[PDB]
């Protein structure tokens, strides 16, 4: 790796080189930058309807919003810095920003502050056993919010209730609004208060002077579904600027290559993205942001030849870069 004369000796495996021309290695211009191009991030998804909502409901009358065919922006949700608890299992939300799933569900309810442990699979008690439960394979990420100045009212917010009892253990993701009566013994209730029959519905005592276990806490569950249908919702991505006349790396939506980008005199149809040659090689690509086609030309490469006389006479050599322009050698 010191002399082109000595590089010839490492290929011929000898200490004496006679007169002639020899090929030693190859020349290749290394890429400098990496161009990442992608289409726009339009057709945004209405995430403010469940996160920045004004209206809400109880723990048993929770609504359901369908999220599909949109872009899932989770960057502002992870760095929100305006919410109480953000804990979830296994999959961290900092790498979920560049993934794609099938369906996304988001709920809306307000629970007590001391009942925050009940929204978990395998938990028993008041809310998980009588109102609403989650299955064991829940891989989503929950999110809560304190609403001491939003949903609180003086005197008491008796417009919303929460169940204290139920007949048996409910199936996960159940939307039960009805008002069945709990029976304990062999005495039937017959829809009226009697022996061994307790009223499950208990009204809320939401007050601005309430404790930590009696304050309204807006908690939203968020679940992720992987189905055999093809994925429709995805995360966002960021592109860079466009560099011309340089052998760089290509990162398009469905193409990856290496070469330079110059102006093309061709005409493309609006029902096609890129073009190809007769030997299945790409030569022209369209920018997904602005409607302009760019030619794909590979940067220069070629073999290296060493012209030298015999070593018994002198030691001066000549280096010939075959097919390479010497504006690009230094």
């Amino acid at each position: 790796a010191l002399d082109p004369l000595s590089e010839t000796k490492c290929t011929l495996k000898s200490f004496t080189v006679e007169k002639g021309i020899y090929q030693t290695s190859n020349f290749r211009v290394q890429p400098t930058e990496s161009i990442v191009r992608f289409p726009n991030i339009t057709n945004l998804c209405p995430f403010g309807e469940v996160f920045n909502a004004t209206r809400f409901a109880s723990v048993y009358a929770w609504n359901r919003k369908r999220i599909s065919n949109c872009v899932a922006d989770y960057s502002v949700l992870y760095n929100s810095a305006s919410f109480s608890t953000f804990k979830c299992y296994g999959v961290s939300p900092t790498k979920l920003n560049d993934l794609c799933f099938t369906n996304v569900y988001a709920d809306s309810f307000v629970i007590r502050g001391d009942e925050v442990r009940q929204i978990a699979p395998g938990q028993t008690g008041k809310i998980a056993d009588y109102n609403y439960k989650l299955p064991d394979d829940f891989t989503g990420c929950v999110i809560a919010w304190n609403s001491n100045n939003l949903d609180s009212k003086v005197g008491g917010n008796y417009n919303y209730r929460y169940r204290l009892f139920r007949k048996s253990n409910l199936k996960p993701f159940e939307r039960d609004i009805s008002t069945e009566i709990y029976q304990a013994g062999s005495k039937p209730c017959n829809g009226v208060e009697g022996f061994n029959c307790y009223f499950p519905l208990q009204s809320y005592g939401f007050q601005p002077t309430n404790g930590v276990g009696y304050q309204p806490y807006r908690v939203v569950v968020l679940s992720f579904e992987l189905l055999h249908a093809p994925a429709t919702v995805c995360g966002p991505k960021k592109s860079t600027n466009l560099v011309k006349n340089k052998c760089v790396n290509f990162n398009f939506n469905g193409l990856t290559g290496t070469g330079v980008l110059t102006e093309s005199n061709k005409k493309f149809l609006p029902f096609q993205q890129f073009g190809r040659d007769i030997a299945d090689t790409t030569d022209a690509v369209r920018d997904p942001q602005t409607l302009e086609i760019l030619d794909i030309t590979p940067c220069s490469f070629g073999g290296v030849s060493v012209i030298t006389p015999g070593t018994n006479t002198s030691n001066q050599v000549a280096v010939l870069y075959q097919g390479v322009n010497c504006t690009e050698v230094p």
Binding site: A279, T281, P298, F301, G302, G303, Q322, G323
Partner: peptide, 22 residues
């Protein structure tokens, strides 16, 4: 009388001008 993946074409030693002189 009528590339990309590491293919190159080397030019001959004698051009068409020097063949016509012979």
């Amino acid at each position: 009388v009528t590339k990309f993946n590491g293919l190159t074409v080397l030019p001959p030693l004698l051009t068409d001008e020097m063949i016509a002189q012979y």
